[PDB]
Amino acid sequence: GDRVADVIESSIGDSVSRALTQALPAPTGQNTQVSSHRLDTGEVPALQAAEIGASSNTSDESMIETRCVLNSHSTAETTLDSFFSRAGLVGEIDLPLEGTTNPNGYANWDIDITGYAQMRRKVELFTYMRFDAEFTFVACTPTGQVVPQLLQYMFVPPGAPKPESRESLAWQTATNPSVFVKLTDPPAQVSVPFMSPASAYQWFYDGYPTFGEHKQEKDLEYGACPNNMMGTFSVRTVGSSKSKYPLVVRIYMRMKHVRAWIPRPMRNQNYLFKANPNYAGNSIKPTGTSRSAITTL
Amino acid sequence: LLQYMFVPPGAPKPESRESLAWQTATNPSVFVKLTDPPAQVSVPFMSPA
Amino acid sequence: EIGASSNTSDESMIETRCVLNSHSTAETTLDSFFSRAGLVGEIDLPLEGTTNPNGYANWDIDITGYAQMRRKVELFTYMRFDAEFTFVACTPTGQVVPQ
Amino acid sequence: SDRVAQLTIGNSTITTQEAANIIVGYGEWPSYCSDDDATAVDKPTRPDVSVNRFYTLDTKLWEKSSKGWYWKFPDVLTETGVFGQNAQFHYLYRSGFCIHVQCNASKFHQGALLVAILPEYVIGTVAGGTGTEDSHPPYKQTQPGADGFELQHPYVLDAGIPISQLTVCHHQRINLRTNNCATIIVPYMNTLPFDSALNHCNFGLLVVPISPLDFDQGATPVIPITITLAPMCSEFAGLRQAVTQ
Amino acid sequence: SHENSNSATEGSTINYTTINYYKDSYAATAGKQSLKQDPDKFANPVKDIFTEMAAPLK
Amino acid sequence: SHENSNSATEGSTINYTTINYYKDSYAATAGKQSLKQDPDKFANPVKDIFTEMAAPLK
Amino acid sequence: GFPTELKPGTNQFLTTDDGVSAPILPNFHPTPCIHIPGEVRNLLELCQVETILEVNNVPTNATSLMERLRFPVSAQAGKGELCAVFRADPGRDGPWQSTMLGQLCGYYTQWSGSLEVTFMFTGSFMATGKMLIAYTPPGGPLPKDRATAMLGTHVIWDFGLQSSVTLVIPWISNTHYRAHARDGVFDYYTTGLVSIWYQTNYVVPIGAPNTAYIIALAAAQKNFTMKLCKDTSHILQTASIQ
Amino acid sequence: GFPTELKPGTNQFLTTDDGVSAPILPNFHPTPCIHIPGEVRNLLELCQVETILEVNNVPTNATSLMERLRFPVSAQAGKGELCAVFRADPGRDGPWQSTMLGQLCGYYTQWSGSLEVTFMFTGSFMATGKMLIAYTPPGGPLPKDRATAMLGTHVIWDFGLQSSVTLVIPWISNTHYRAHARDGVFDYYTTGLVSIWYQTNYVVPIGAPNTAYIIALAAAQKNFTMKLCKDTSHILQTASIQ
Amino acid sequence: GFPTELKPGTNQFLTTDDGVSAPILPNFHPTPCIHIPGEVRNLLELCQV
Amino acid sequence: ATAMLGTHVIWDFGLQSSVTLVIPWISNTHYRAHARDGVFDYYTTGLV
């Protein structure tokens, strides 16, 4: 039991989060109210102190004579579902016959949705995002031709054996999930849960995963979060022999049940690499367009 | 296989088949085979007026 | 030497805090561990050769010919279940043909 | 009533007569880890006054040709006082912070600094300039400590992201004709309830001049910027030998 | 009716209305979210608030 | 409603919730099992149990 | 054999279709979610955030790209002279591209509501001055002088302890919503101009510097909404990523 | 002709899809089930079972493969010397591979909860001794001496009538769940080390043997769970079965 | 696997068929309609002109 | 850096031209005698 007064009157162990703000409903845009003229002293709503770090609480009712406007413009299309529940390209797998890419008939793809700029810049608006997903696989020939071929889409989680071939033993999918499809069918579409050991994925990780000295050898590890390495996507031509059709598998991901935290500045520079916020330092481009002078247009 | 992309005003139009606009991360799209029934989508009233 | 396992907890070995666990034991059940389709058989129907050159093939049902599903069932000595078999037919190359 | 402030935590006390206000980050004050959010079962040590107190790191000089500086948290306190021993002796760490930046100048001085908190401030590099080399930052740039590091390209924050949208995080301004202190209170921000203090840095602290310092010849040309920061609601768990990195 | 509550949003005070044909809740439709906002969390994150008509530096 | 109770689990006190479109119960979905456990059947299979704090060889 | 007829719209993948898909992992409960601060629920929480408006978007070289965040104000002859002028169009390629409003508007096709531009004076405590910040609604060409500009919506800003004024650019439009403008028939959706004029002068004592800078900060108001989500146009990627 | 539209996800065989299939034998009631003992309902009933941990996993020849189930303890100089050291990682390729926990964890991707290692002394009744069994949480390198190891979680075990102690390796982790570790960035999921040090000595009288062996037995605790079922990696099959 | 039989009239596009199609823009509320005069509700309003 | 680890005040000059550093009672003995160079440095109070 607690006897001394500094321990009885202590705020240690206050687990309850003390919040200043509260979320209120805003199904529509705020309505404008009627305003008249103001000719007094002391009350000066146009003057702010931006050094506070807050934003201006000035409205148009206090800057001009306004009318009543009953707004019925909905804020429903700015939600995170409506902004992210839109399938976009996150992956592309090529299965050729001759060449170097994948000449054996199988292809493993380390899952990362940071290889296509248009979906990456949408997620990197936040640093933490938690969601369930819906992946869709659009398979076709280079020319776009639909051909009579069977494939197997195996999810290889981390730790499970990756297939070293088409005739491999990992393809028996006794415990790993798999999808068999013909190219003549609609694209395969499966729903995936939130599968992180953490409470949210994170597109930016300011740190190293491992302890120890950090020399130039193990500097690749900077930024790598194992909580986002969700495993491997594998694909093959179901068969003991060589296929006759070249193939491409394109992967489209749609988020659902989205939560996000901590918005960030948006990428203005061209991406260069996967899971690396590097940029071209010689060819730094300004965020927008330029002028000849500041007094013109 | 084809891809029917709706490009609203302001969004980038594709300058080619290999273009970056086709990733349909935010624009709506429909993928269809010609062997399928014709694609059929419903559209709302989308005017600022 | 009793042959039992230790009934010692971490509350008795270290000074512990309260942890309100909400980690579910639902994925360790035998349904969730075995209700996952895996290869138990493969039948080849060639034209020339020795395997089955006549156009028919009989397969004595035993799911002990593929190591990845066998080692899952041989964790137990007795198992009672209803099943769901699925037959994925194709050419050697994986080509779907009108047959 | 709002330009004066006294910040007392521990055995430490800051006065300011020319303040703006206090920024409480994301409208959350720092707190302790609840039993629902917790997963580790060891009892954490909560040293109230020996680690939750104001620490003063160093002093950067605002010159005309300045570009900016960043500091990474909690790397700034991993070699300092009792905090940087509990953090080395333990494996897990949880804390908020009160950052407080000081820059004094006269009434005949002009300039502005953006003082901002950027979570998970991952550091990119110029990639050889051409963008072909997949270069990486060394350890003395991602965890630079209490000395901080000088921004090479502060327009993109050395991460390809514009400085102009950085007010979407926490921030204050130090406008020398209005204020000389900038006080931000940051909670613990991570996907996990605890994490390592030596491997992972939760956020960065940027100090960038948007408007450049100017004065006429005769005034005090040394205008220092001093970083002063206090942990809040600190917690440590998982005790073993002291390792530094 | 009886279903695994194993979506990514189970555990929040926001009320959804999804459609599902499976036992897993994460396979469901995304649905309509609640139209609640908290702009002061980013736009007015100050300890001691100020009103509009007043001069804040007081 | 009226259906052949001819699954492999009919005849146990564990309650399932399956979906079926046929008259045979074994065609149904697997469903959710009951989350009951008996570790002492393998981990403490002793005639005369012992408590934690006590020395067992007494 | 419940008889059905398959209708058109069959075996197509529409990316914005929200339906039920098949789950891969049955009886998977995810990791619980702890309380993380900074939870976003609507992007209009961020459009109401003040971010820096790059009015002086003249320099391009890397040596002088931080100069784009503040524009100068100096001593003049007292003739009501012009400091700066820019468009009030967020989606148009100009100063607003630097803002979080001007980048989240790329992902939406139609916007409505009032804006908010906050200018902060970053000069000496001893420097004084008065400025006229005029919003010129559409039709109005670029005003050639201050007399033509005070006929519009305007604020006269007196420098002082409160170093910041807010010009509210209010919703003065024919359409309920407004799309993105550009040179052509989409100038129908132009919002107007914003100009800054010297009212009196920038008066400074001896010993203080003769020049200062003003940092503009632009956001949106509580009546602001966006509509018809799309893909952004004013940022593009050179191909061959990684 | 009830009109329908077929959505994507059509005519695919997803192995982890639980639906209704067509029955081959109508009006088939199976054989009744008698009461068989040993009914399993959850694999966590078996993760809580003590199985032998192969600490001394040095020998490989068939002549000496039973030596892997017990490790020696002998007479020392009384300098706090080291007997054995091993990782507390079940999924990592090492001593825990011999356990039922370390083989059922191959079929799962993420684990959480406390472990349990039980060491039994298999010496003479007359032999005495005291040992320090230290669990070193992560970050901590291999302790070079006993002084560096007693700073961690530890048990001092006195041999006696009760020939067995239990070191509980408790859940001390940043993540709620923990995946399988290996040399690389998945060392982020390392659990720590476990070391055994001589506290006093192995004291033995004249006539008794100067050497004994200790058998380690490893299990899991009541807070242990696994998640995200997969296929096992640390056992593989040379092809051409039968 | 709810069993069904597909009947004839399948995978045809009948132009005067009024059914539900898939929407491209979820959570899209259109612009409100102001009172415009001259609203037609039936063409027999104009045959009487 | 070695001094901010103690009890300290940061004083900003302004209108209020005066700060007060309170040197608080941090002592082993309830009372404290006068110190000097020798064994009565046991009663030293510290530095400022």
Ligand SMILES: CCCCCCCCCCCCC/C=C/[C@H](O)[C@H](N)CO
């Ligand atoms: C046939 C089954 C296929 C199912 C495959 C689904 C894979 C599930 C992964 C979804 C989660 C992706 C999250 C990715 C995060 C980022 O890529 C990482 N932070 C890497 O930068």
Ligand SMILES: CCCCCCCCCCCCC/C=C/[C@H](O)[C@H](N)CO
């Ligand atoms: C078109 C109808 C095809 C239906 C064929 C289904 C066959 C039913 C058999 C399922 C039960 C398999 C149990 C097998 C057990 C082991 O193989 C034996 N102990 C042999 O080692």
